[PDB]
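lol forgot to send this yesterday, sorry. struct tokens for the thing we talked abt
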């Protein structure tokens, strides 16, 4: 009842990639139970960024996942207290980007506070030379670990000319709600398609959309 059919969000983001500091803010809305959302983003400090904006995409919203098949919803359950997440994304060419995030609910609006720290993105690689074209769809595996959930995914970043640069995500999701007030899910999977809808001014304005649907494995079992 705290998370309604349509929800708005406001976001603040600050961090560094290699040696370059920046801040963003964003606002948007979506449908938490249908698992769709839109964010309109502004780089408000340090723009234009010297790196492809694509590497920030996953840092801009776990409340908007359609949890199907009765999967207990760790994220929606966490309100009013909210939750946090922390992640390491490792690119196969040396870039590493960590991020920590706080998610709260204030006067009916979701509030995100995110911090980014990326290092060792190769100065002559596709991210620094802006040869990227957004992400392929992906499937994240989530599983309970230590009272929270952990997530694992490999994502494919499309490159100019075809071809991909791969990265791996390891995420820890922590609820701010007491564990005895949470019904934990078993292992499940989130199918996701994160898409750049619009951009302008050398990526200092960006519009992103995501659709995300959670499910069990639907293959028959011999056991």
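and heres what i got for the seq, position by position
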């Amino acid at each position: 009842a705290l998370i309604t059919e349509n929800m708005h969000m406001k976001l603040y983001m600050e961090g560094t990639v290699n040696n370059h500091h920046f801040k963003c803010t964003s606002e948007g809305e979506g449908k938490p139970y249908e698992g769709t959302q839109t964010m309109r983003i502004k780089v408000v400090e340090g723009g234009p960024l010297p790196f492809a904006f694509d590497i920030l995409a996953t840092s801009f919203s776990k409340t908007f996942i359609n949890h199907t098949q009765g999967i207990p919803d760790f994220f929606k359950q966490s309100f009013p207290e909210g939750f946090t997440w922390e992640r390491v994304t490792t690119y196969e060419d040396g870039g590493v980007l960590t991020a920590t995030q706080d998610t709260s609910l204030q006067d009916g609006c979701l509030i995100y506070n995110v911090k980014i720290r990326g290092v060792n993105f190769p100065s002559n690689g596709p991210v620094m030379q802006k040869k990227t074209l957004g992400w392929e769809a992906c499937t994240e595996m989530l599983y309970p670990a230590d009272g929270g959930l952990e997530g694992r995914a490999d994502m494919a970043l499309k490159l100019v000319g075809g071809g991909h640069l791969i990265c791996n995500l390891k995420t820890t999701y922590r609820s701010k709600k007491p564990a005895k007030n949470l019904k934990m899910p078993g292992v499940y999977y989130v199918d996701r398609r994160l898409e750049r809808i619009k951009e302008a001014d050398k990526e200092t304005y960006v519009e992103q959309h995501e659709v995300a649907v959670a499910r069990y494995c639907d293959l028959p079992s011999k056991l």
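The two ends are 37 Å apart (CA to CA). anyway ping me if u want another try
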